[PDB]
């Protein structure tokens, strides 16, 4: 279908739910849903929820909270304790399931206790107690961008967030100390101009993953990065030859 | 002139023409023309035509058709055999004209059989000879800023390319095989992060043109490119030292010696 | 307060004024003011002014003019001669105050001659601005940078000048006296460098030495351009052309 | 030079510890010249801790200098201090080396074992690398081994158990990296991680090889192939 | 099998010939033959010949000529016109054979008219022209050549064996006086920048430059200068091979 | 003329002079003169003098004096105070002459005490440059230096530190030490050929252009180290070391007018 019929589908689904709770991450999908909900139902029928957790950065949460206020939404912070579950804490291969369970269950309690008809998230085309309307309307990454520019949406988080769990090998126990170590290492690298980066944790070895197109530009920073991540507790600071992923 | 009077000129020409067929590329100018024609004459008086060829990728054909449908237009696909004209197949320096003639001839066949008064294109101020293609934006004295002024004014925000003939030296015969070879090499290079790229074809040699500011970024990919483009059929994969568009970024002395050497 | 009440105060202030002249830079603030004026008073009561001078590039002036026209405004270009004021010519710490004095004084002349009630600028929550009686309507209505963006999305604004282009005086040490020739030398050097793909760049002037500042993340990309930049900037009159090892700032 | 000639003449029958390097090569012929080919045997050790290419180049050079040459084979991994790579392993390895040479020299009637360190008669004659270079050409010597090697144990953490496999893995990886033009290189072994040390001035020249080195060192058994940002040392 | 036995064999064969002419390249093998010939037969029975051609550079001919003087030998330069043979001129895969055939035949004109018994070259462990490889008949391997060179105090030879410029041309493209000079000047310019092992491969209007891959990073600073220099030499397009040297 | 005949010219020249003094810098030229003199005249008639000054590093002095010992030459040190001359101390464009005159007067003052006839230097193609008289070129010195078994010279040319300062600048112990410490730090990093040009608070680093890409990994360490030595701004010259010598034909001629404009 055309973008007009996909948008009309979205409006009808929203009109029928009447009052919604929106899982708000700050990326372009969730920003589109949140802004479409506000324009169809108005601020007082839309609660935006932003998850605050130890597995994502303080910077991403702060920008999301302020982004929802900029979009004109009542925004709420909720705090998740992902490490309270033994599967997540010990970083087993199915941790994604226990983490997403804890998230949507908290979001269901929020929407149940404020009278919302569903929880909305930003899943698109190409979690059963969530409605992903963009995927129900057959939106693709191309469509979300087309519809966002039409509404004048302009200020979402342009770099993808993933849980810090992925920086640790399966079986490694996540702790406050070693999560903080990875977060400070990745934060410093982003501060040098590398928004997409991974510091993979191998105890005394840091393995840095960069997009291969940036590795040439990184050379000027070797020695400063070496000394900075050593001051954080790594003994060996390395650059992965395979690049990012 | 004022932007308000240039628009009134454009509507007068549209209202007077009653039924039109628009060559629609997906760029801002063809998008403006199509949307003004749709707004002045209504959906059942406007056929949007999108051309599919061997000289362009299927992806641009798909995105042009999606843009015309999203504008709410009756859209028609037509596919051309550019390689059946030997001025084009043998790639002489004027193939651009014989290609545009073949294109405008098919568009005038479409306009004759659907009862439209003219064929419209999106050429602005700063082929039609024998066809009768009217560039109403240029007839109403539109400039690139005026097209954007009217496009924001009408709520247009979603618009989208060069013929593959430019990748071959004059006299080299274009074939389905060597066209596909060039298109795949350019696509693979784009997938590595180089959106502006040309793979110039010299039979068994591939000559890659890059913006000079990216050549340093490219080195990590040399061996992968070399082996990828060798599997695409090139024997030698090379990088042009002048980069993409030679001379533009040189100093006033060697810009003048790089132009004299052309 | 809410966005919509600060919007209403802003609409009220415009309605009373009827005819306005807008100092238009192209950044998010000036474009917000200009767009609120166009939508409250109509195109025929809103003159947008863009200043042209020796201390800024022809490229930034042309984009500001094109942005105002593209947003649907009647736009006017005014050329200021900042080097005729001794305070600016001598490159002292108060040169900016005299430059903005000369700007607001010209804008009050443009506004008298087209029948405008106020001069509007894009300041949000300064001595020259008040003395000239120019109005910061966003600042009166208690806008902050987040409100400016909230309102700009609400109105569908998505192009403004994201670069904060800076006066060329910052390329000279305090006390070095600006001339037409050494300004032109630096301006051509930065224009040449931007044309190679380096949009954020400074050519600091140390008499016969040019000291180029690049973001450290770009210096590797620069290597292929060493010899061309060396000869181009010498042909502009520098004896020595150098690259700062510390980078930008 | 006068000092060196004095000491060798007095030693009558000698055996030379032959490294293949320029210093060691001086001592062999320097001696062959004053004591005769029949009473100077050159021994070159074959081990798992040094490369086959360095062993093969040394022995043929001793014949090239005109010497009775012997290859003795040392099993350094038979010592538990070496096998487990403790901080004093250099001492237990050096004992096994010089003890095998004192067996060969005792057995063939050699009066001493000599090596090339600047008994180190070259160290006794106040030689430095420059003095060694002028005198070596002086007898028309032009062929040694220009790369002076270090034991493969330094590629392993203290406490890591050396095995035939993990040594071979390290040796093939460094051999590949040298083949690409990086003669000074270390492949430090961290189980599934390979950590490459290059001189910092070569790291830029290396970029063109990232992807090939990654795949080559994985096919050698590493899961992750990395480059140390601090560089060589 | 010993070196001494191999040396004596070489000495015996030289004594037998009495008057010889040596094809002298400057490499270590041709230097060993020349020095052993001078020692066993004396200066007036040994002619050293150095070939001069369009297929090699002038400074490479001069360095071999000056090295032959350093050994104390009467050396004469001879110049070959390789481009006169169509097998070489049109660059067929057997062009190497006709060049070397033309080479050894000129050496036999010189050896006939100076009364020499054989033409000697340095092949180690031709057959048409009767040229003798005494190092090959004396069972020399690279280590024997090196051992004997040290014995005689030989330390000066060409360590970089030069290759005919024919390898810069594809099979079938015809060599001309101009396109050789074009390729040789291009390579000379690239060496002057600090890149000693390099090839400028010729593809009509395209130059395909081969560099060792580990130097390609170092090359970037010269791109534009190399581009314009080789265009001023007559190439329309100047390119760098992504596969590197001997791709 | 072969090496053989030019060497005999040199050997003939040495025998006639009987007693010599050799200006020994440690480069390839002086080492050839010094080693040829000993082989013609013996250790009892070849006085070698090596100069120590404030304009050169202690590393050069010690490296030069050690070599004369290897060549078996009687070698003595002499110390020159170049900073006592106002032409050298204030670095005017003829500073080079008054420095070389002050050098040669010490070398001839010594000549009489030695009892030597002439004083010899390594000038190639009352001083005497026998290599220059015998028609030696840079290539001839290399061939004869191998034939005589010499492989020690100082392989990188060293020049007086005066060239690191603009004409008119007063040389001091403070600024000389600053320039020398900056250069030694850069040499310590793997760049044996380097210059730190002194422009008051600006350091301008000259590198051979083939090394500049290799330098990027040290930008930050060099920036901070040279600031600690007293420079405010640390910069890299875009023209490099010996600007123009390695440029294409057109742009070499253009950088040569740029040079001669000052
Ligand atoms: Cu880059
Ligand atoms: Cu390098």
């Amino acid at each position: 279908a055309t973008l007009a019929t996909k948008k009309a589908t979205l409006v009808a689904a929203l009109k029928d739910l009447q009052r919604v709770t929106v899982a708000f991450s700050g990326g372009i999908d969730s920003t589109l849903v949140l802004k479409m909900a506000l324009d169809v139902l108005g601020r007082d029928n839309v609660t935006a929820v932003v998850a605050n957790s130890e597995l994502f950065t303080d910077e991403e949460f702060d920008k999301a909270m302020s982004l929802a206020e900029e979009l004109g939404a009542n925004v709420q912070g909720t705090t998740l304790d992902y490490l309270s579950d033994d599967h997540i804490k010990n970083n087993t291969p199915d941790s994604w399931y226990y983490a997403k369970k804890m998230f949507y269950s908290r979001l269901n309690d929020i929407a149940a206790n404020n009278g919302s008809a569903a929880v909305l998230d930003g899943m698109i085309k190409n979690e059963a107690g969530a409605r992903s309307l963009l995927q129900e309307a057959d939106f693709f990454k191309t469509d979300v961008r087309a519809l966002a520019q039409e509404l004048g949406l302009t200020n979402w988080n342009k770099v993808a967030s993933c849980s810090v769990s992925s920086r640790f090998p399966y079986g490694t126990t996540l702790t406050h100390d070693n999560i903080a170590q990875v977060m400070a290492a990745e934060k410093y690298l982003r501060s040098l101009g590398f928004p997409t980066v991974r510091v993979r944790f191998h105890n005394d070895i840091a393995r840095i993953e960069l997009p291969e197109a940036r590795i040439g530009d990184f050379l000027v920073f070797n020695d400063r990065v070496n000394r900075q991540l050593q001051s954080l507790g790594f003994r060996y600071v390395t650059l992965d030859l395979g690049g990012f992923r």
Side-chain angles (χ1 to χ4, degrees), chain A residues 1-59 61-99 101-108 110-124 128-140 142-157 159-245:
Chain A
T2 74
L3 196 74
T5 52
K6 305 205 194 196
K7 199 203 186 165
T9 306
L10 195 70
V11 171
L14 275 176
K15 263 160 183 181
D16 213 66
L17 292 154
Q18 300 171 28
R19 161 149 315 174
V20 297
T21 308
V22 177
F24 191 60
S25 84
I28 197 189
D29 303 332
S30 85
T31 292
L32 181 57
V33 174
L34 179 66
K35 181 51 162 205
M36 281 301 302
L38 287 171
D39 285 16
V40 174
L41 319 180
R43 158 195 298 261
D44 292 291
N45 293 295
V46 186
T47 299
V49 179
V50 177
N52 195 7
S53 72
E54 207 166 335
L55 304 181
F56 297 84
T57 68
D58 283 346
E59 160 174 10
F61 167 93
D62 290 327
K63 292 202 59 71
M65 289 290 276
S66 98
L67 181 46
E69 252 169 270
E70 208 166 288
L71 288 186
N74 303 325
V75 51
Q76 186 176 348
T78 187
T79 302
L80 295 154
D81 192 7
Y82 285 132
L83 294 195
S84 68
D85 183 304
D86 285 328
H87 299 81
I88 297 170
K89 167 102 173 143
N90 296 308
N91 201 40
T92 73
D94 36 14
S95 285
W96 64 274
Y97 160 86
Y98 297 96
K101 176 159 155 184
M102 174 172 323
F103 180 94
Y104 285 112
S105 99
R106 158 74 48 82
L107 261 63
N108 279 315
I110 287 169
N113 270 326
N114 66 10
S116 315
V119 172
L120 313 185
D121 67 29
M123 292 190 58
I124 64 130
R131 284 292 282 293
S132 315
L133 298 187
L134 291 180
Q135 155 204 288
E136 304 182 4
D138 282 13
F139 272 85
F140 314 117
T142 196
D143 298 325
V144 171
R145 267 177 228 244
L147 182 55
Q149 172 72 16
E150 197 172 297
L151 309 186
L153 282 183
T154 59
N155 204 41
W156 63 86
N157 177 10
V159 57
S161 290
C162 322
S163 148
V164 75
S165 299
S166 65
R167 284 71 156 168
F168 297 91
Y170 288 139
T172 314
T173 279
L174 279 54
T175 69
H176 305 299
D177 288 1
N178 64 16
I179 285 168
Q181 193 175 328
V182 175
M183 301 279 223
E186 287 192 15
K187 182 197 197 166
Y188 176 76
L189 289 182
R190 288 185 314 261
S191 93
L192 297 170
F194 304 96
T196 315
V197 65
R198 299 288 188 275
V199 182
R200 307 281 189 210
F201 181 96
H202 303 257
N203 295 304
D204 56 339
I205 296 181
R207 169 173 62 91
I208 292 163
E209 298 192 17
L210 278 184
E212 281 195 279
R214 310 291 312 289
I215 292 200
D217 309 317
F218 183 84
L219 185 69
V220 71
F221 295 112
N222 287 5
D223 168 62
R224 266 164 304 190
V225 164
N226 194 49
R227 303 278 148 210
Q228 192 63 14
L229 276 55
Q230 268 163 13
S231 75
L232 299 163
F234 290 108
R235 190 176 187 207
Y236 296 108
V237 183
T238 70
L239 185 76
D240 190 307
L241 293 186
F244 179 47
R245 302 231 206 85

